[PDB]
Design an enzyme around this catalytic site. Structure first.
Site, mmCIF file in Angstrom:
data_model
loop_
_atom_site.group_PDB
_atom_site.id
_atom_site.type_symbol
_atom_site.label_atom_id
_atom_site.label_comp_id
_atom_site.label_asym_id
_atom_site.label_seq_id
_atom_site.Cartn_x
_atom_site.Cartn_y
_atom_site.Cartn_z
ATOM 1 C CG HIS A 72 20.112 -18.930 -11.353
ATOM 2 N ND1 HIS A 72 20.250 -17.755 -10.646
ATOM 3 C CD2 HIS A 72 20.109 -18.580 -12.661
ATOM 4 C CE1 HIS A 72 20.317 -16.739 -11.487
ATOM 5 N NE2 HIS A 72 20.232 -17.212 -12.718
ATOM 6 N NE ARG A 75 8.324 -24.081 -9.856
ATOM 7 C CZ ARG A 75 7.362 -25.003 -9.860
ATOM 8 N NH1 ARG A 75 6.508 -25.086 -10.875
ATOM 9 N NH2 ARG A 75 7.262 -25.852 -8.850
ATOM 10 C CD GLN A 273 12.242 -7.671 -13.335
ATOM 11 O OE1 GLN A 273 13.448 -7.664 -13.071
ATOM 12 N NE2 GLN A 273 11.682 -8.611 -14.087
HETATM 13 C C1 LIG Z 1 20.072 -13.743 -14.411
HETATM 14 C C2 LIG Z 1 20.164 -12.225 -14.260
HETATM 15 C C3 LIG Z 1 21.625 -11.805 -14.098
HETATM 16 C C4 LIG Z 1 19.544 -11.485 -15.451
HETATM 17 N N1 LIG Z 1 18.108 -11.309 -15.245
HETATM 18 C C5 LIG Z 1 17.188 -12.255 -15.609
HETATM 19 O O1 LIG Z 1 17.582 -13.322 -16.070
HETATM 20 N N2 LIG Z 1 15.813 -12.043 -15.479
HETATM 21 C C6 LIG Z 1 14.883 -13.078 -15.904
HETATM 22 C C7 LIG Z 1 15.330 -10.858 -14.957
HETATM 23 O O2 LIG Z 1 14.115 -10.662 -14.862
HETATM 24 C C8 LIG Z 1 16.236 -9.881 -14.548
HETATM 25 N N3 LIG Z 1 16.075 -8.624 -13.980
HETATM 26 C C9 LIG Z 1 17.302 -8.188 -13.829
HETATM 27 N N4 LIG Z 1 18.263 -9.077 -14.255
HETATM 28 C C10 LIG Z 1 17.575 -10.177 -14.722
HETATM 29 MG MG LIG Z 2 23.013 -19.032 -16.134
HETATM 30 ZN ZN LIG Z 3 19.405 -19.165 -16.668
#
Ligand SMILES: CC(C)Cn1c(=O)n(C)c(=O)c2nc[nH]c21
Ligand SMILES: [Mg+2]
Ligand SMILES: [Zn+2]
Length: 326
Positions: A72, A75, A273
């Site tokens: 977070h 980027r 994923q």
């Molecule tokens: C931010 C997170 C709680 C949710 N989240 C996410 O945003 N991305 C991009 C993922 O690839 C991902 N994989 C599990 N949770 C994810």
């Molecule tokens: Mg957020």
């Molecule tokens: Zn976000």
């Protein structure tokens, strides 16, 4: 001649419009230029009389307020904004949305994770952090991101909305708040259900319908890493797990509950994923595809490919751990 990095080349400007854009190639300064170009290109500077210099100061201030978390960070916000920019073109959003709605979508995307601590709402709540106390356990992070967004815009030299009449400001503010708060994944099922309920007879002229469509759009962009080319998407997974493990580690040292999906012992790049792509990403882009069919081939395609690749990776990861554990 041979221009400097911050001066985007016509190839980059062209590439910036597609979800295939390599977000890892640029340094912050170059990413800022990309965001700046988006505002001019979308006609927002023009239609909202945004002072072009204020636009730069604002983006710079926005950048300064993003923390250097493994996931977070700035980027990530560039990725969300750049995917939104891509969707505007892919889905011809300027035919369906007003310029105010476009402004709301883009500004919220850029501002959606401002000053993220690196620990989610569950951590804020369980650890009774100052943020959780300030927001009474209600989407504390998102409420905070949103608040920082407007404290920034409250600074005159950063107020890209200084030339918008007050009623326009109120409308934009309300819209941005709604969208940023909508990024809290805890509300994912709720928001998806409301959207599908209206999707039974969607009406582009229905304000409630459009608000839900915008919430879905920013949600799609926020969690859109896997839609990008495999080589661009994959490194983001390690960044997320880095952030997740840091939290579960801390949650164990402080005696706070731990989420299995953040458990250093039960989670791998593949397990994280596979489920997320199959039960969050695909279903959502699937419903969005009903409205914009072109989204299937451009974004559902790579998601299907990613799902299949991670399932293969899992098989060999499992095989590998079958040589371990004495
Ligand atoms: C931010 C997170 C709680 C949710 N989240 C996410 O945003 N991305 C991009 C993922 O690839 C991902 N994989 C599990 N949770 C994810
Ligand atoms: Mg957020
Ligand atoms: Zn976000």
């Amino acid at each position: 001649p041979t221009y400097p990095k911050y001066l985007l080349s016509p190839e980059t400007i062209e590439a910036l419009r597609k979800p295939t854009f390599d977000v890892w190639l640029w340094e912050p300064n170059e990413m800022l230029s990309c965001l700046e170009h988006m505002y001019h290109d979308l006609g927002l500077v023009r239609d909202f009389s945004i002072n072009p210099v204020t636009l730069r100061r604002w983006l710079f201030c926005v950048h300064d307020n993003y923390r250097n978390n493994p996931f977070h960070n700035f980027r990530h916000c560039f990725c969300v904004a750049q995917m939104m920019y891509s969707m505007v073109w892919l889905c011809s959003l300027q035919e369906k949305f007003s310029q105010t709605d476009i402004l709301i979508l883009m500004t919220a995307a850029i501002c959606h994770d401002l000053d993220h601590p690196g620990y989610n709402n569950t951590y804020q709540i369980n650890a009774r952090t100052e943020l959780a106390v300030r927001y009474n356990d209600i989407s504390p992070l998102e409420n905070h991101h949103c608040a920082v967004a407007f404290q920034i815009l409250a600074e005159p030299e950063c107020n890209i909305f200084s030339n918008i009449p007050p009623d326009g400001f109120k409308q934009i503010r309300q819209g941005m708040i709604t969208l940023i708060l909508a990024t809290d994944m805890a509300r994912h099922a709720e928001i998806m259900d409301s959207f599908k309920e209206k999707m039974e007879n969607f009406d582009y002229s229905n304000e409630e319908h459009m608000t839900l469509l915008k919430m879905i759009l920013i949600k799609c962009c926020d969690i859109s890493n896997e839609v990008r080319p495999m080589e661009v998407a994959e490194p983001w997974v390690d960044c997320l797990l880095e952030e997740y493990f840091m939290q579960s580690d801390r949650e164990k040292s402080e005696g706070l509950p731990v989420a299995p999906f953040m458990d250093r012992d039960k989670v791998t790049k593949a397990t994280a994923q596979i489920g997320f792509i199959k039960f969050v990403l695909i279903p959502m882009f699937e419903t969005v595809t009903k409205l914009f069919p072109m989204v299937e081939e451009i974004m559902l395609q790579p998601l299907w490919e990613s799902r299949d690749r991670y399932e293969e990776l899992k098989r060999i990861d499992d095989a590998m751990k079958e040589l371990q554990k004495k």
